[PDB]
Amino acid sequence: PIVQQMVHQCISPRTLNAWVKVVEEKAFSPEVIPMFSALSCGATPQDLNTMLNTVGGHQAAIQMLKETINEEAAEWDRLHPPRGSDIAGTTSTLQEQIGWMTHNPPIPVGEIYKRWIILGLNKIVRMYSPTSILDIRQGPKEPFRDYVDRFYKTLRAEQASQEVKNAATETLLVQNANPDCKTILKGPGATLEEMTAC
Amino acid sequence: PIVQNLMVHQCISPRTLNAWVKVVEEKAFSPEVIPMFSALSCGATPQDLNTMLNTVGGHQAAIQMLKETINEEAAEWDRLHPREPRGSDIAGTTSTLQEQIGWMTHNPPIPVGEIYKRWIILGLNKIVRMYSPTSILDIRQPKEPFRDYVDRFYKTLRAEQATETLLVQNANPDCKTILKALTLEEMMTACQ
């Protein structure tokens, strides 16, 4: 990455292993996306390519990420007749990438390429979402906390539009609670902390 | 975070990242996860705070309660403070990193990192209070040692947040009679 004078630094073994381990453990869970963006803080497109190349397996997701990078680079070449392939780090040297990022005014090709990677990872996380929100009901003796945890965890991954998320929370959350809790929740317009011990 | 060199922004460290995700994984929302968050978020910008909360997998019930708490504190900040940072700028949603750094490095400074961390720690205290398994009123001492009972009492009191009254009131008649006759050091040595 590019750290502060702004100078390049080799990607650290701790950051590498932390990224390989968070992909091995969490696969493509929603929290892997902000873990990628945090570990790629200040990263050049070369450092970004290194993080994705170090990912072993998940090659169906890696290929979907590439095709997303191809789409966004092709859209960048339509809007800007650095080219998209230079942002992706394929047709630009490390010196050229450092120049674009360290320029005044700068061209944050690192952040432009990371924006393409993050967008593709969102499409991967949405696809790999196992269950639907319309299948997260509480059950006999599941604590309400555990049920709401699973609810918003399934809501987070499916990435519905914010209008759907808000409405699914006010309606489907209380609708799918067990009658023990469902009857206690009932007055309308309650907050999640009000929604009490059950 | 913003750290002083030999004040400049710095990327949040992987050690800090992994320690936070592991402390949430291990201790969930115990009372001692609040200072751990505050110490790991030391000098953190609102962007670095959002990153720490976004890297948290699961517990999305607490994550949502934390969001709704931030909404109340940001709405309250917009009421008291009608470029001066609005509540959404402090939460990092409508402010760029340059903007947040400019507010924190200003002289005089507007510590949007500590104001946004205040809202986060506040919602976290509500979460820990909700995640308290038992109530303090349901904390009573047959042959359980008075040490273990006091440990559970102040652990339930710390999470829930009549201490001197309910403590001696809920002890077994063996220790309750001694305590009613009578500092916690003296109370524990009197029921050893």
Binding site: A160 | K67, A74, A75, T93
Partner: peptide, 13 residues
């Protein structure tokens, strides 16, 4: 609501 249910922290409206 500055942050909405399911929307990430720091999400632009």
């Amino acid at each position: 609501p500055v942050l909405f249910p399911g929307q990430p922290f720091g999400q632009p409206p």
